[PDB]
């Protein structure tokens, strides 16, 4: 498996009173490990897993610094945004950013990226080529020309191939004995009566890490989706995940339906039958 280091950042202009809040969250392989949060009095980056607490005192000094920088720019970006879109003056708005790296297990960069969204929608995104931008709309074109003029693209490209890789690799080593673990899902099928002589079979997957999984119901013919409800993968809140997938069957015909669970923490894929 490849791995990622991603930062997800949010700026929210509060209506009348308040100033913008600002939040900076970073994730190694989709596990949170550092957070920064504007509302605190003691606004500081902080460890979010046990293995980041082991880190050189001045790591934080450094990261906190950058956060205040970015915080300040956010305030300004929000005001800029407002003027690009000619928006009514009184409302609550949002700027969000994501950037990070996925690198293979051989240690080479796979994809680097950085995207901004305004009020929940795509604004601008660095292209996979790491040197051209994609504007989502006419306001973002203003920024794109700014960033083209400011050589922004080169600075991000340098960080993505530079600091992020180096640090990704370095965070893995730190919490190496946890982010690499693999818990396999425990599955069962439940049964439920239904109006008209219909039956909900529901296929459960519990206790798995990492989150990625595939639950499918096959009517002995491999393919099945028509009338097949499944929920988004959800955290059980102990480090593991949960998911289920249900299907409705004519009463009497339960045995014809098999559930299949694919997950990387399994010797081999489970099949289940009521």
């Amino acid at each position: 498996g490849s791995h990622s280091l991603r930062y997800f950042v949010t700026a929210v202009s509060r209506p009348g009173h308040g100033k913008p809040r600002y939040m900076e969250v970073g994730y190694v392989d989709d596990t949170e490990f550092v957070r920064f949060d504007s509302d605190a009095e003691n606004p500081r980056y902080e460890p979010r897993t046990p293995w980041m607490e082991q880190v050189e005192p001045e790591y934080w000094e450094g990261q906190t610094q950058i956060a205040k920088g970015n915080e300040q720019s956010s305030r300004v970006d929000l005001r800029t945004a407002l003027r690009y879109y000619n928006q009514s003056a009184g409302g609550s708005h949002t700027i969000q950013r994501m950037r990070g790296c996925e690198v293979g297990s051989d240690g080479r960069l796979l994809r680097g990226y950085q995207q901004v969204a305004y009020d929940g929608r795509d604004y601008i995104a660095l292209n996979e080529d790491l040197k051209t931008w994609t504007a989502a709309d006419m306001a973002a074109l203003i920024t794109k020309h700014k960033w083209e003029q400011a050589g922004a693209a080169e600075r991000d490209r340098a960080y993505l191939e530079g600091a992020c890789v180096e640090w990704l690799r370095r965070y893995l080593e730190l919490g190496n004995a946890t982010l690499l673990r693999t818990d396999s899902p425990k599955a069962h099928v439940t049964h439920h009566s239904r109006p008209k002589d219909k039956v909900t079979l529901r296929c459960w997957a519990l206790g798995f890490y990492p989150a990625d999984i595939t639950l499918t119901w096959q009517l002995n013919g491999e393919e099945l989706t028509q009338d097949m409800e499944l929920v988004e993968t959800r955290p059980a809140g102990d480090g593991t995940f949960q998911k289920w997938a249900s299907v409705v069957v004519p009463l009497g015909k339960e045995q014809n339906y098999t559930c299949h669970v694919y997950h990387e923490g399994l010797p081999e894929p489970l099949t289940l039958r009521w």
Partner: peptide, 8 residues
């Protein structure tokens, strides 16, 4: 580690 973000 995170970096500085360009202003939009």
């Amino acid at each position: 580690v995170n970096d500085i973000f360009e202003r939009i």
